[PDB]
Design a protein around this ligand. Structure first.
Ligand SMILES: [Cl-]
Ligand SMILES: [Cl-]
Ligand SMILES: [Cl-]
Ligand SMILES: [Cl-]
Ligand SMILES: [Cl-]
Lengths: 323, 328, 327
């Protein structure tokens, strides 16, 4: 069973999982989502206590862990940012061992991947990465569940998508790893200086060879987006990035009437954010990486994607800790 | 009535009919009794609630948490963050995301327009734990408290005075509530600190229909004469002018005597500056030779004071809001 | 199997309890630990709501309270450090009376013992001290359970232990009070300026005289540790303090000076035992040392019981809550 192989695993990065393991998590996320909506959800974390360590705040990721935990019968302790990071006055080795004695599972959101890998080695319970500098694996699981729901029977391995703008960061990295694992066709469309780290690219190309996937890095929007089922962006220099804004024209360049728009959030798409009025003045634009028109269109699936953060985090905890 | 309230927001008392408000108060009394008898039935089992506090209030937060726990719900407390909603992300976007994950949302914060936006976009019940303009949960607690302490009198038969600075959420809400419930309210304070003139006019129109009365006066003796309840709240180097302006409106034993009512009771939303057991309270009182500000220790700790029953009733009335709107 | 109970009592400091009452909290902690591990735990705080007030942050104490409560069926509101300290905008008497109307029990961690005593006088519900300037009673219950688990049939009154370094603080104070109450032999081993408050020492000597306990204060390590079942230390911090405290480092040589093959090492945590912390490494490096109050070799040895001791924070807080609020 992929189920037996996932028990007691940490969830630190998608590089640590096989194609089939990732597909299992996504399929479990879909089952849990269906069960919650039907009122038939079976609690598999009943009596479990979970610690949520946020060295950097993220309300979106925190809420997704909390609600998943509550729904599954667990209780949570939220430990927010504090000015004294782990490793300042107490080693991560020591912190991990103490937390592991008290809690049944631990989430960690913070800085370097090295820190969460250390937590994962010493806690003695499942550790789950809610974001590090290098990777954002729970986001990409949500993104993949969302693509499946909006791609009308197409499997991941059949899907083409482009990520626009600054790809040299956790969400870029993870999207590229995920695409390679699952056999997808991913284009990273942005200035060459902001493509992902070349060593990660090479590792992903090798994975993609095994899966039938494709990774294209390009400065050319028209060629990057052509034929895409999804277009994805994130916040991101302005003069440099402006050509990569997702507007209706980019949508039209895909040549695909069913193209959908994704964004991990939060997004600068208008004047209503405080930055929005500033920059609509400061560079004469209404919205940055995406326009209000695209964000609020029927092409936009950003809020289904946000909701799926909870279902996919729930699957991670249920697969690894669930009883 | 119960069916009318299902899935509604609780944003301000202006959004509710007389009978709905009476229903929420009666429910609060039932839930209080059930809790004390150990017969409380959980109606929020399995529900998840988000508590957004853009400005911290431990009192309101604890009332919401305890009410939720007692009813079988779970809570996520999201406290002040240095970035107010609308900085990195619009309230429209924040609402739509929270609304996908939670079953109910409390908001405590700044302008009424913000909570109204949250209430428009969330798609689940949104409850106002305080905004600049209104504090509706406090006033439900207050009205329950009055009914418990008025010996069979109905709200429509009650007379009360609010002393001091009325130009704020609690004053606004007390005036709306009184009008909706047909009560006789006196706002007693400097004219500059009466409630907004447009709201007053709106409340006069409501009061005309309900049999209520709204009197605004600078005259303490005339304002408090015949009252069943006297209500105040805090007024405040920067505060000297406000203390001198408000000092005539201090609730002391003499004001109680001016009611002519042996049974008069004293209410305060808290926290209160009634002695020198706070840093700010002692400082400012000392600066004027006072002991206690808006109310005296003698009144606050007397048998006439019901402030702690009133504070407790915060929880029972928040519980009723959540049960009526989200309960099943 | 007791004649008394602690129902509706506060837990403010060990001085407030008799020898038998302390023993009962320790025995209950053990039973609760056993039940959790066996999956037979019965929830005695079902339906109870607890407020956790931290004026000063302690993730370790907070997590212990939260897990204990969850395991027992209770729910919790964590009120962290916030810029409004109690007594700023509102008196403690007023805060206490409001919290006591809403919650079934209240933990307080903060500043002076006087504050928590006032809370405990006015709340009308049980109040538990998670740490004040003067006392750390929950830590010492965990320490005593840990000692009993690792001492091979010996009762507290038969145990001898030494606390090394800076004893003039809550943990030193509580260890001394507890040792006195339970009839133990405690040695406080450190520079004389950092022995516990002289009035408390006198009070503890009077208690010890009634229980068969012994309290020894000494600057001499070899004499202080000789025969000890346990060696305990805590962080002592900085140049003047380090030179002063350095002779009291727990290293393998101090373990050897006990003459006891079964000696165990305890530390309330966190500990500066190596260079895997920013603060620990900077300070140790400027002074040429790998670890401060204890060495890596001791801390990671089979003599070290610090992670059992950390786990036992939870079991013992659970006992305090069950005993005083449990239904
Ligand atoms: Cl995120
Ligand atoms: Cl990843
Ligand atoms: Cl209102
Ligand atoms: Cl309030
Ligand atoms: Cl103590």
């Amino acid at each position: 069973a992929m189920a037996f192989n996932l028990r007691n695993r940490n969830f630190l990065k998608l590089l640590d999982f096989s194609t089939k393991e990732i597909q299992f998590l996504i399929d479990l996320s879909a089952d849990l989502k269906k069960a919650k909506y039907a009122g038939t959800e079976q609690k598999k974390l009943l009596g479990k206590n979970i610690a949520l360590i946020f060295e950097k705040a993220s309300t979106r990721t925190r809420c997704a862990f909390e609600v998943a935990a509550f729904d599954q019968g667990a209780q949570v302790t939220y430990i927010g940012p504090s000015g004294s990071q782990i490793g300042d006055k107490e080693s991560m080795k020591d912190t991990a061992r103490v937390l592991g004695r008290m809690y049944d599972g631990i989430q960690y959101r913070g800085f370097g991947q090295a820190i969460v890998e250390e937590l994962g080695a010493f806690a003695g319970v499942p550790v789950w990465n809610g974001l590090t500098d290098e990777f954002h694996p729970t986001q990409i699981l949500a993104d993949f569940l969302t693509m499946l729901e909006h791609s009308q029977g197409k499997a991941l391995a059949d899907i083409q998508f482009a990520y626009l703008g600054d790809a040299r960061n956790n969400v870029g990295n993870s999207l590229m790893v995920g695409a390679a694992k699952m056999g997808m066709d991913i284009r990273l469309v942005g200035p060459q200086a902001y493509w992902p780290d070349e060593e990660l690219v090479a590792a992903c190309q090798a994975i993609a060879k095994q899966t039938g996937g494709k990774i294209t890095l390009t400065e050319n929007v028209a060629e990057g987006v052509q034929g895409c089922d999804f277009l994805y962006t994130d916040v991101w220099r302005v003069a440099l990035m402006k050509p990569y804004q997702v507007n209706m024209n980019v949508l039209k360049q895909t040549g695909n009437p069913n193209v959908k728009f994704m964004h991990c959030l939060p997004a600068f798409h208008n004047d209503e954010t405080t930055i929005g009025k500033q920059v609509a003045d400061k560079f004469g634009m209404k919205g940055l990486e995406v326009t209000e028109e695209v964000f609020e269109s029927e092409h936009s699936i950003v809020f289904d994607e946000a909701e799926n953060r909870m279902h996919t985090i729930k699957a991670v905890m249920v697969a690894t800790l669930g009883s």
